[PDB]
Symmetry: C3
Subunit: 114 residues, 3 copies
């Protein structure tokens, strides 16, 4: 699985442990070992949400399976909670796009997962 | 809806007011209230289009519905027009990927839109 | 087609010519003219793969058709090769998401395909 967060919160406000915390928490939520988890955080971005420049986040979560109605509702709680606590972003200023990827459409280690 | 623009144009070329303008124009085009519109502009990127480093843009528009044949032509005219006028990027050096998101695959405030 | 690579490798480690190379190699692999190939490289990123900060890459390839089982394996081999050789990123620290775009969902030159 792969999680990306794009935010206008400055780099200095992203804690040093935030990528490891995300990795561990997403491993537990998705049921996948932490070695399979990739995380990417992009601070200092020029963005707006609802026409305001207050802290906000545009995120994506891609996984081969483990994406669906109930699972996504649960991920959104987990992730809004982490972004609220660690980056101080209000949960109503967060969008997470979820992508259920087909194994044939994910490349890794010179090949794909299919 | 969310609109992201990645561009090799420098940050100083992005006019004050561009994010508001995009928010207002996209609210009008998509028929969604400005409160749900997110916009993200990423200047100074290392990119090429057709092997040339002249101004270009790689963009994305995600929405839950409001995505389709005729609508996307209209958005492309709108968006390329803004990128031409405000950032001086030729329309033929722009790509916009359109994503019709399933409400179950969009997280927002501790839940999804489904 | 458009290829984006996000990586924690520093900008100074991206060799002169890398975007031209990716353009030429992707034109060849996809069969599309180089004029329509876009490439975007984003170094110095804050990222982790498997909870480690060693060199890694998160990538995306979008194309209108030319995406599928066998083709995707061949692109992965080409692209992990390039990221290994040019950027010194191990292929087992790379993810590439492939997207088969509908022509109606790709805007260009004031209109869609």
């Amino acid at each position: 699985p792969m999680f990306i967060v794009n935010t206008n919160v400055p780099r200095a406000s992203v804690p040093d442990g935030f990528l490891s915390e995300l990795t561990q928490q997403l491993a537990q939520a998705t049921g996948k070992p932490p070695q399979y988890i990739a995380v990417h955080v992009v601070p200092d971005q020029l963005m707006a949400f609802g026409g305001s420049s207050e802290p906000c986040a545009l995120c994506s979560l891609h996984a081969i399976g483990k994406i669906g109605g109930a699972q996504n509702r649960s991920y959104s709680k987990l992730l809004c909670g982490l972004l609220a606590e660690r980056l101080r972003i209000s949960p109503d200023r967060v969008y997470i796009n979820y992508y259920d990827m087909n194994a044939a459409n994910v490349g890794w280690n010179n090949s794909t997962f299919a």
